[PDB]
Structure formats: structure tokens, C-alpha cells
Amino acid sequence: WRKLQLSRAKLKASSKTSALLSGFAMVAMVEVQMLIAFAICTTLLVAVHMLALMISTCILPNLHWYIETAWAFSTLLGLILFLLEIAILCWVKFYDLSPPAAWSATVVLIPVMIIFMAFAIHFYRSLVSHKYEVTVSGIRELEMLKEQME
Amino acid sequence: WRKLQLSRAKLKASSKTSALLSGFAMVAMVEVQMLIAFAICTTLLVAVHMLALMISTCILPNLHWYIETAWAFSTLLGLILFLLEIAILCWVKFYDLSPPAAWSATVVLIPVMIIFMAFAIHFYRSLVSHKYEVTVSGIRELEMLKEQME
Amino acid sequence: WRKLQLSRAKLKASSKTSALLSGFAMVAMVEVQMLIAFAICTTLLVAVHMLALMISTCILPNLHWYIETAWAFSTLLGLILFLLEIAILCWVKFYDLSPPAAWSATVVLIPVMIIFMAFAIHFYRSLVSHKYEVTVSGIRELEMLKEQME
Amino acid sequence: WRKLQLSRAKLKASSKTSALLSGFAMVAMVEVQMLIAFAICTTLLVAVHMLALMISTCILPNLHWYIETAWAFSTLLGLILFLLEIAILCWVKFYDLSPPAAWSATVVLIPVMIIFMAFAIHFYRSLVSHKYEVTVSGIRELEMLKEQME
Amino acid sequence: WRKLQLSRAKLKASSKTSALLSGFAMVAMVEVQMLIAFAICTTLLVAVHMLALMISTCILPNLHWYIETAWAFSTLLGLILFLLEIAILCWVKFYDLSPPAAWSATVVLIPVMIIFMAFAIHFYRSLVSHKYEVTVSGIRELEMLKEQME
Amino acid sequence: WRKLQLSRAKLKASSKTSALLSGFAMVAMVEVQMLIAFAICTTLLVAVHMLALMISTCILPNLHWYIETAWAFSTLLGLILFLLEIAILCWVKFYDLSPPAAWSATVVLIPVMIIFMAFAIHFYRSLVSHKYEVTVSGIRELEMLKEQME
């Protein structure tokens, strides 16, 4: 039952978060209407969420770990892009009269971005260690029974 | 119970995702206000979601696999269109003074689009193999009982 | 329990879908600000969803089949209208400078609209046949018991 | 359990429907920026939903029929107003150059509005009769036991 | 179980209602861009919802009645403000050419506002009486057992 | 079961609240298009929510207290920023013709901000005391059994 709820909660959140970000980012682009980066960022950001949303639909009818990677990787990737998107927006909006303030947006972007990716590495690192930790402990216990077995 | 939740979760997500995309895409069009493609893409994109939403309503009161195809196919088709829609938007917004940056939008579109369709093929391919895999295994087990039966 | 969930899921989806479409369509109209059709379509579309939403509220406290017709009919009717609405929007937005592209919107509208209504007819047709199918089978079984009864 | 779900489903739908309508109607007003009616309609519409939303909050901690009236009456009243609001919007947007089309909006409004209120009367009328129907049937059964009792 | 659901339903509704109102009110302000009141009302309204949202987050990990007051008071306070906000918006939008219609907005505001606060007083008054009612009934029953006890 | 629901409810609310605020704040910035503060505030605000949303995704597959800190701290931090964001918006919008009224926005901001942070301190302070309160009571009870044990 715990596993069923995990997918259920993940399905709604992923769709809700991915859909809104795509729509708002899209509208944000039309309102204003580095130069090349803005176009590429918006397109890539939307595509990532779309592919992820598809995963929610394909999994419904239904290797499991492989597909899981796509959902986690895409959702995470999209979030980072959204962060990159807003930074560009400020640069684009202020780009006309506000160029002076525009720089602060990207400069302050680096700090949070680094911590964002760095924090993920630490969490993952600890997880990997646990996998190995259990492996050593598991075989150890079996040997205990095996030894006494003889 | 597992089957009931599958439809329940799919119903909300499909409606939430399809509805928002339709509304935002619609508004995105009015804000700005290849040339012909923009009009066709928007209309087709919305229609796909609408038909899908209807499926959610018709199934509520209630061959099952046939209807399922419409929901999965439409939702997937709409997502691809939304991706095509945003690419056109950038081309439309920048189309005036920004034509130079405009190309990057469509050029970067090809990459994601290919993977989008290609990935679906792989997932489906594996599924088809499983159907056959079970067929061979099933008849095999029955023969086992049949042979011993004699 | 299966019946309770059916209404519960239907209540949320109907409200979420009907509300958003009404709001977006409303805003889409103010942004731009055949000519007569645009005004009539928007008003009628919103009214349908409103009446439907009311059904969700009235049923909460609580012939059952009769009211059900209003919910299914209204929701379905509204969806078709939303499709008609977007087609008009393209015609309205492009109508000024965009006439070249405007036509494609309505022309491509016909295809999806036809299939939309046509598909509903097929599904309903199969359902009606089932109702008659059961009737024949039901009386048949009773006769079996009736004959042996004598 | 059936009663608990009734309130739970009603709480979410009421809040979701009332909140969105209030926000969109509010934004619709700022975009454009009979004359007096537009101002009064918008303010009254929002107030109705707000009071209703409060009901959802006040009932959470917790005569029951009395409060129920406020929720049903307010939600229903607000829906009717929203319908009146959109009609005014078309009249306001087109009011400048579009007056010819503006009339169709209000004219087509009367039809749906009438049926909207008229339909409610029929449903309520049937309900009232049922209450009396049970009253007569109930006393009748008791008399049956009373007569045989002697 | 009844208590758990009460908080669960309250958590989602509060967040959904508070978040949307804050966002729309914020956008409504940028679109148009008494004079001083408009600025103060918007800031205060948003702050109230934010603090409330925090309550939802802080309570998750977890005197209970004290915190409850903040949620109910803030949510209720915010709703009243939202009502005050829309009235100001009409006054602001029409303030230019529409001053004549502007007055009707605030004038019609008084009626609903009065009933809003007044209705709350009646509901609370009845609740207080019940608390005392039970107190008298409780001691009475105990005395009954106490008397017969001797 | 109580613990499972806690995370489930927290997951949806966090995503819904964080996503909407990010989108609206983003759009609010494009509509208008201290000077430097506006750019920094918007970028930082969005980044906080994004990192938080990631937490919802990473925890799904799965020290527990450590990660919990990120979710609570980020969500809370973002809310405060949103409050700071709106204050800047008023200052930015009125900044042109409205400078006079602009001050009232920030001045009235201080009051709510102080109470916002101050209130959290009191709640946390009481919690800490309880932790120590239980510690003293716990050891005390064990001694009772320990003494009688001898």
C-alpha cells in the first residue's frame, strides 16, 4: 500500500508542477514581445516536462528502475531550467532600459545554482554508501547462520 | 483496488494537464496579436485534449482496450503538439525583429522531437515482446499439465 | 464503494475543468479587445459550465438518471463549444492583419469537430444495443426456469 | 462514512470554483481598463464567494441545515452572477466599436438564465412532493400496526 | 480518523484559496499600472495569507487551540481584505473616466460587508451558548449519580 | 498510517503553493516591463521553491530530519520572499507616477514582517520546552519502576 501511494502522489505533483511551469514560461515569453539563449532555454524547458508527463501516462497501464530515472532526471532537469529561464527573463526585460540591474540577476543566479546541484550530489553520495553498507551487513549475517549451521 | 486507483489517478491528471495546456496556448495566441502553421497547430492541439477530456466523462458511467487507445494516443499526441506550439511561438514573437534568434528555436526543436517519438517506439517495442513472451509461456504450462494428465 | 468514488472523482474533475475553461475563455476575450458569433459563443459556453457546476452542488445534499443527463450533456456540450471558441479566436486575432492564416484555423476545425460528434454516436450506438441484448437474454433465462418449473 | 465524504468533496470543489472565478473576474476587469452595472456586478460576485469560502473554514471546527443554506445559496447565487458578469464584459469590450455584436451577448443570456432558474424550480417541486408522500405513507403503516395491535 | 481528515481537508483548501488570491491580486495590480489605500490593502492581504500558509507547514511536523486561532483568524481576515481589494480595484480602474460608476462599488460594498461580519457573530453566539448548555447538563447528571450513590 | 498521510498532504501543498507563486511572480515582472533589489528578489524567490520541489521528488523514492529541514526552511523562506516581492512590485509600479504612495507599501511591510518572524519564534520556543519537559518526566517514571524493582 505504501508503494501505491508513492506513485499516486508523485503522479499528481509531477503533472501539476510540470504543466503550470510550461504554461507560465510560455506566456512570459509572449508578454515581453543572450538573445539566442532565451529561445533555446524556453523550448528545451517545455520539452523536458512534456516527456516527463508522458511517463505518467505510459506507466499508468503498466525495467521499472530505468523508467524511474527518466521521471526523476527530467523533473529535476526542468526545475533547473526554469531557474535559468527566469534569470534570462530579467535580463531580457531590463535589457532595454534596465541593463544595469540585469547583471545582478545572472550573477546571483550562480550562487543558488551551484548549491542546487551540489546539494543533490551529497544526498546521492550518502545513498550510494548505504547500498554498500547493507551489502556488507547482509552477507555477514548469512555467514553467521552458515557457520553455526555446520 | 489497484485497478480502480489507476483510472482515478489517470482521470484527474489527464483533465488537469489537458485543460491548462489548452487555456494557456489559447491566451498565448491572443497576446502576440509558418504563418499558416501557427493557426493550424493551435486548433489541432486544443481539439485533441477536448476529445480526450470527453473520454474521461464517457468512461465514468461505464472494448475497454479500444477506448484506452484514444486516451493514451490523444494525450500523447497533444503533448507533442504543445512542444510544436511553443517552437512556433518563439518563431512568431521574434519573427519581427528577432528572426536571427528565431532559427535556433526550431533547430533545437528537432533534437527533442526525435527523442520524444523514438523513446515511445522503444517502450512500445518492449511491451509487444512481453505479450508474445507470456503467450509462449502460457501454452507451455498447460502442456505440462496436459502431458501428466494422460 | 465503487459508486461513491465514481461521483467523488466526477465532482472534482467537472468543477476543475469547467471553472478553468470559463475563466480562460473570459480573459481571452478581453485580451483581443463572425463578429456576432464570437459574442454568442462565449456567453453560451460559460452558461453551460455554470449550470453543470450547480449540479455538483445540488447533488451533494442528495430521478437520479435524469439529473445525470444534465451533467453529462452540459459538460460534453461545453467542451464542443470551447473547441468552437478557439476557432473563432484565431479568426478574430488574425482577422485584422492575420487573415492569411486565420482561415486555416476554421478549416482544420471541421475535421476534429466531425470526428468528435461522430465518435460519440458510435459509442452510444453500441451502448443501446447492449441494453436490448440484456433484455433478450434476461427473459430467456426466466423462461428456462419457468419451463422446468412446470 | 458517506456523510463525511459529502462534506469533504463539497469543501474542495466550493473553494476551487469560488476562488478561480473571483480571481479571473477581477483580472478581466483590469484588462479592459451598463457602466454602473459592471462595477456593482463584479463587487457583489466576489463578496458572495468570499462569504461562502468562510463557511468552509467555520464548519471545519464544528442549525446544521441553516448554515447549509448559506453555502448552497451563495454558491448558486455566485454562479448566476458570473453568468451576468461575462454578458456585461462583452457589452463593455465591444461597447466601443463592437456595439452591434454586444447586444447578442445579453439577448442570448436571457434564454439560458430562464431555463437555469426554471429547472431548479421543477427539481425542488418534485422534492417537496416526496416529503409529503413519505409523511402520508408513514402514518399509514403505523395505523396498520396500531389496528392489529388492538 | 474524523479529526485527521479535518486537518487534511483544511490544509489543501487553505493553501489553494490563499495562494490563488495572492497571485491574482498581485497581477491585478500590475495590469492597471484611495491612492494610498490601494497599496496598503494589497500588501496586507498577501501577508495574511502567507502567515497562514506557514501555519500549514509548521503544523505538519507537529497550545493546539492557540495555533488554530491564527489559521481561522488569518484566513477569515484575508477573505475580508480580498473583498476590500476588489472594491478598490473598480475605484482605481474607473477612477479615470469611470468615476461615476466607481461610487456604486464601495456603496454596494457596505451591505455585504455588514452581513458578513454580522452573520459570524450570530453563529459564534449560538456556539457559546452550547458550551454553557453542556456545562449545566454535565454537572446535573453527575449529581444524579452522586445522590443515588449515597 | 498517520505518518504516511503527513508526507502525502505536505507533498501536494508544497508543490501547489511553490509552483503558483513562482509562475505569478514571473509574470508580474514581465507585465510592468530598489531597481537592483527587484531583480535579485525575483530570482532568489523562484530558486528557493525549485530546490524545495526537488525535495518532494527525491524523497518519493526513499538523515530524515536533515532533509526535512530543507523543505521547511525553503518553503518558509520563499513565503517571506514573496511578501518582500509584492512590496517591491508596488514600489515599482507606482515608482513612475505613484512615488508618493510607494512608501506606504514598504512602511506597512515592516509591521507584518516583524510579527511574522516573531510569531514563529514563540511557537518554536514552546516546542523546545516540551521536548525538555518530556525528558524530565520520562526519566522520572523509569526511576519509579527502578526503585520499586529493588
Author numbering:
A (entry chain D), B (entry chain E), C (entry chain F), D (entry chain A), E (entry chain B), F (entry chain C): 148 to 180, 191 to 219, 240 to 327
Give me lines lifted from the publication on this model.
To exclude the possibility that the crystal contacts in the H206A Oraicryst structure were responsible for the conformational changes we observed in the pore, we determined the structures of wild-type (WT) Oraicryst and K163W Oraicryst grown in the same crystal form (I41). Well-defined electron density maps of WT and K163W Oraicryst were obtained using non-crystallographic symmetry averaging of modest (6.9 and 6.1 Å, respectively) resolution diffraction data in the same manner as for the H206A Oraicryst structure. Anomalous-difference electron density peaks for sulfur atoms of methionine and cysteine residues in WT Oraicryst confirm the accuracy of the atomic model. The structures of WT and K163W Oraicryst reveal an ‘unlatched-closed’ conformation of the channel that resembles a hybrid of the quiescent and open conformations: the ion pores are closed as in the quiescent conformation but the M4/M4-ext regions have conformations like those observed in the H206A Oraicryst structure. The conformation of the M1-M4a portion of the channel, however, is like the quiescent conformation, and as such, the pores of WT and K163W Oraicryst are closed and indistinguishable from the pore in the structure of the quiescent conformation. The unlatched-closed conformation has analogous straightenings of M4/M4-ext as the open structure, and analogous crystal packing. Therefore, contacts within the crystal and the straightening of M4/M4-ext are not responsible for the opening of the pore that is observed with H206A Oraicryst. As in the quiescent conformation, anomalous difference electron density for an iron complex is observed in the basic region of the pore in the unlatched-closed conformation. The density is positioned roughly in the center of the basic region in the structure of WT Oraicryst and located in the lower portion of it in the structures of the K163W mutant, which removes the top ring of basic residues from the pore. Thus, while necessary, unlatching is not sufficient to open the pore.
